[PDB]
Structure formats: C-alpha cells, structure tokens
Design a protein around this ligand. Structure first.
Ligand SMILES: CC1=C(/C=C/C(C)=C/C=C/C(C)=C/C=C/C=C(C)/C=C/C=C(C)/C=C/C2=C(C)C(=O)CCC2(C)C)C(C)(C)CCC1
Length: 314
C-alpha cells in the first residue's frame, strides 16, 4: 500500500536536461555583495540591455498598483530614496519592503523601471557618478555578461522578485484573449492533448482552463523555484506572471512511466512581454501526467544552451 510518485520524485523525470545552473549560481554570488555594489550592479546590468527590454506596455498596465509607493519615494529627499532602495536589495523587514513583496512580479518590475527612469532624470538619488564595483561585484557582473541575453533577464527577474521581505494579490485581473484571436500549437513528435491544451490555454491567457488540466495535488514548478501545489495556488501564480507570454513549443517526446503515468518532455522558447524582438529563452517543459491525463507535475526550466532543445530521446 504505497505511492507511484511524489512531487519530489516526479521532479527527476528526464535527467539529461541541462538547466542554466549559472543563473541561480550568479544570483547566489550577487547576494553576498554589499547593498551599494548590488544596486550599482543592477544599474549596469539593466542599462546594458538597452533595446532588449521593452518596458512600456507592462509598466503601464501594472503602474496603478505601485503608484502611491513610487510617489512616496519621489517626495523623499535623496538620502531617504537611497536608503529605501538599500532596504529592498538587503531584504530588510520594513513596511515598504513588505508592501513590495505583496506586489505582483510585473508591478515589482514596473516599480524598478520607474525608479530607473527617475534615477536617470535625478528625481531619485542615482548611482553615484563613476561608481565602481568591488572586485567581487565586478566578477558577478562579468558572469551575468557571459550569459545569453534571455538568461541575464532571468537573473534580473530572479533578483527583483526576491527583493523586500521574504499572497501576491496586488496585480491586475487577466483578460483571456478573444476566441477569434487564439493560436493552435503544433509540436513535433507529440500529440498529447493535455500538453497541447496547456500550451494553447497558456498562450490565450485562459488560466482557468489551464488550471483545469492539473490533478488536485498537481504542481507547477517555475525555473529555479519550488513547485506551486494545487489549483488555487497555481491559478494565483499564473495570474501574477503568465500574462503576455508567447510560448513556442517546438518538439518533444512521450514515454510511459511507472503505474500508467505518462512522462512528456517538450522543448521550445518563451517570449516574455518584457522582451525584445528575437529574445527568447530556450525552455524545457517536463510533464508528468497521471493515468487520467491530468498534470501531476509540469516543470519549466531555462535550458543551459540551445543544444538542449534537441536533447529528447532516450
Ligand atoms: C532593480 C534595480 C534597477 C532596475 C531594474 C530593472 C528595471 C529591471 C528590469 C528587468 C526585466 C524587465 C526583466 C524581465 C525578465 C523576464 C523573464 C526572464 C521572464 C521569463 C519567463 C519565463 C521563463 C516564463 C515561462 C513559463 C512558462 C512558459 C510556463 O509554461 C508556465 C509559467 C512560466 C514558468 C512562467 C535599477 C536600474 C533602478 C538599479 C537599482 C535596482
């Protein structure tokens, strides 16, 4: 009397999948730096991207939620403005740091975008002119710079959402696309209707229909994060982060797994609404589907290199 799979065990499907281990490795080294090296580093890392980041639409959609905090920061004198940003990057326990944690990912990113423009403008205390990183800061920055552009964005995203204090409810409601404006996924080697439905629903921003594909104890595991377990939790996450994505699943493989479960690996690209033209992250989706065809786990990973797109069969 036992269990074929746990979420823990499920997470080992498809072991020859190389993830971009350098992303969290670099975030971990970033976390050892001083607050002033940290903010300067993000300044340099952010600013480097230039055109790669398309900040305009997402900022606009999300700014209602950050407006009051931002304007409160706007009215502070420079030394208070610096101190608040130091509090966020240090993960201090302040009411502002807690309000920051309650913001949705896209609100957090629009917040920092606004601070980036005001810093440029000198409405917010900028990074001191000619500020120069420590040897350790400099090294984290070169590590970032060695990554593919999408992976650098992953670093930035990871750092941003983990600032402030450690239920994300302050985000906009998601409009699903019109029924007349949706796209049907085609994946080479794969006809699995759960997988195609996951792709199509996610692409249409129909997160009720995507959550409906999961088991009651099913789980969605983002890149470098713990699994999110159960429909209410998965829907909440999808509302926070999955608006505006263009998923391009390209290939995959299906195999039977123990106890009439089915294991499905897909590789492809995502484009975030924050990304430019031709920026995509290469992803794996690794599904474990129970015998009833429902998602017990889907695990999304950023791939180490484009070589991993065709790492499929066994
Ligand atoms: C901080 C800071 C500053 C400003 C920083 C700014 C302004 C940063 C902007 C960064 C941005 C805009 C990054 C955006 C990145 C987006 C990424 C990398 C998203 C990837 C998405 C993926 C991989 C999604 C895939 C998924 C799929 C396909 C699924 O099947 C299910 C869900 C999910 C897993 C989500 C300044 C300069 C002031 C200095 C002081 C501190």
């Amino acid at each position: 009397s036992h269990m074929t799979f746990t979420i823990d065990s499920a997470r080992s499907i498809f072991p020859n999948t190389q993830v971009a281990d350098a992303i969290p490795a670099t975030v971990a080294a970033f976390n050892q730096l001083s607050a002033e090296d940290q903010l300067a580093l993000l300044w340099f890392a952010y600013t480097e991207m230039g055109t790669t980041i398309t900040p305009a639409a997402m900022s606009a959609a999300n700014m209602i939620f950050a407006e009051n905090t931002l304007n409160e920061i706007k009215q502070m004198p420079a030394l208070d403005q610096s101190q608040v940003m130091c509090d966020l990057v240090n993960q201090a326990d302040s009411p502002l740091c807690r309000t920051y944690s309650s913001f949705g990912m896209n609100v957090k990113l629009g917040f920092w975008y606004q601070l980036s423009e005001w810093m440029k403008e000198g409405i917010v205390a900028p990074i001191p002119e000619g500020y120069k990183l420590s040897e350790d800061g400099s090294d984290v920055l070169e590590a970032i710079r060695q990554l593919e552009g999408g992976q650098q964005l992953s670093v930035l995203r990871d750092i941003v959402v983990n600032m402030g204090y450690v239920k994300k409810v302050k985000e906009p409601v998601v409009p699903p696309k019109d029924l007349a404006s949706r796209s049907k996924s085609s994946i080479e080697g794969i006809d699995n209707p759960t997988v195609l439905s996951y792709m199509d629903n996610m692409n249409a921003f129909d997160f009720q229909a995507a959550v409906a594909l999961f088991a009651e104890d099913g789980a969605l595991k983002p890149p470098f994060e713990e699994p999110i377990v159960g429909k209410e939790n998965i829907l909440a996450y999808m509302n926070e982060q999955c608006y505006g994505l263009k998923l391009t699943p390209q290939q995959g493989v299906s195999e039977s797994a123990a106890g009439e479960f089915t294991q499905v690996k897909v590789t492809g690209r995502v484009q975030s609404p924050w990304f430019g033209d031709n920026v995509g992250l290469n992803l794996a989706w690794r599904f474990l589907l129970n015998p009833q065809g429902e998602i017990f786990l889907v695990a999304i990973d950023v791939l180490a290199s484009p070589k991993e797109l065709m790492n499929l069969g066994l």
